[PDB]
Amino acid sequence: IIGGTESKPHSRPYMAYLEIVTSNGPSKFCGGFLIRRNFVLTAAHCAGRSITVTLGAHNITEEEDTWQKLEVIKQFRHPKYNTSTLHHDIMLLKLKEKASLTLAVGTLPFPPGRMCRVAGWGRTGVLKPGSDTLQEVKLRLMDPQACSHFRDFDHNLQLCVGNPRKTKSAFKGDSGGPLLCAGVAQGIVSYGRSDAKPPAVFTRISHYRPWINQILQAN
Ligand SMILES: CC(=O)NC(C)(C)Cc1c([C@@H](C2=C(O)[C@](C)(c3ccc(C)cc3)C2=O)c2ccccc2)[nH]c2cc(C)ccc12
Numbered sequence: 001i002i003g004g005t006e007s008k009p010h011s012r013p014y015m016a017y018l019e020i021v022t023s024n025g026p027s028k029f030c031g032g033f034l035i036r037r038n039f040v041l042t043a044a045h046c047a048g049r050s051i052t053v054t055l056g057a058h059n060i061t062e063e064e065d066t067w068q069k070l071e072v073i074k075q076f077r078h079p080k081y082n083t084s085t086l087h088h089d090i091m092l093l094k095l096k097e098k099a100s101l102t103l104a105v106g107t108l109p110f111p112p113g114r115m116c117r118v119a120g121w122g123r124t125g126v127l128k129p130g131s132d133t134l135q136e137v138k139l140r141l142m143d144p145q146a147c148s149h150f151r152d153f154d155h156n157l158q159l160c161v162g163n164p165r166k167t168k169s170a171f172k173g174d175s176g177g178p179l180l181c182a183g184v185a186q187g188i189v190s191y192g193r194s195d196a197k198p199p200a201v202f203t204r205i206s207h208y209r210p211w212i213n214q215i216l217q218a219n
């Protein structure tokens, strides 16, 4: 998160920190959010050989009783995900066991112009490491023409988030996190520019409600 503030500890108890293993490199990182006691929503490009989910965190460098470190049994990447266009950048993670409900850990249930909020542990600048603490920022929903320069952007599948006149933005490390508009989840962080100039591209959740319901009902 660029240009944001430190979240109040444990104020977003659905938030998930993902550590992802690839075969021929060190760990990489993404965000996500708990939608059922044994399911986490995130981005398809965050898939790997194996993934560990940490719930209940604020400062990710200091172990505490609120932490739940949970095993992933299976990854459900969207079957139409395209690595060229980045269309359909969405994935469900099934947890080996159901999470415990505490003050610090719980689910987020399901229900241009206005303001929304996004949170994550990602980089705080182009040449700056990821944040030790959970950060968040308020951003403007933009009309789709603001994202024309992303040649594979589509208004039906995606949202355009962040006023180009400000520095505030999601960035690398924040992919898979939720965008909340008046307390309701409307988007998932996907991608943007290498130089971090806003706006960025988010997945539009409403389009995928049939697919999400299908996975949850059969697993
Ligand atoms: C290739 C490339 O450099 N793409 C651009 C867009 C320039 C940079 C970019 C990415 C990028 C990316 C990673 O690296 C990382 C950390 C990751 C994590 C875990 C895994 C397993 C694989 C990768 C991740 O996310 C990415 C995005 C999409 C696809 C692939 C990689 N995400 C953004 C989010 C915003 C807000 C802004 C810009 C970007």
Ligand SMILES: [Zn+2]
Binding pocket: 009, 010, 058, 064, 066
């Ligand atoms: Zn704590």
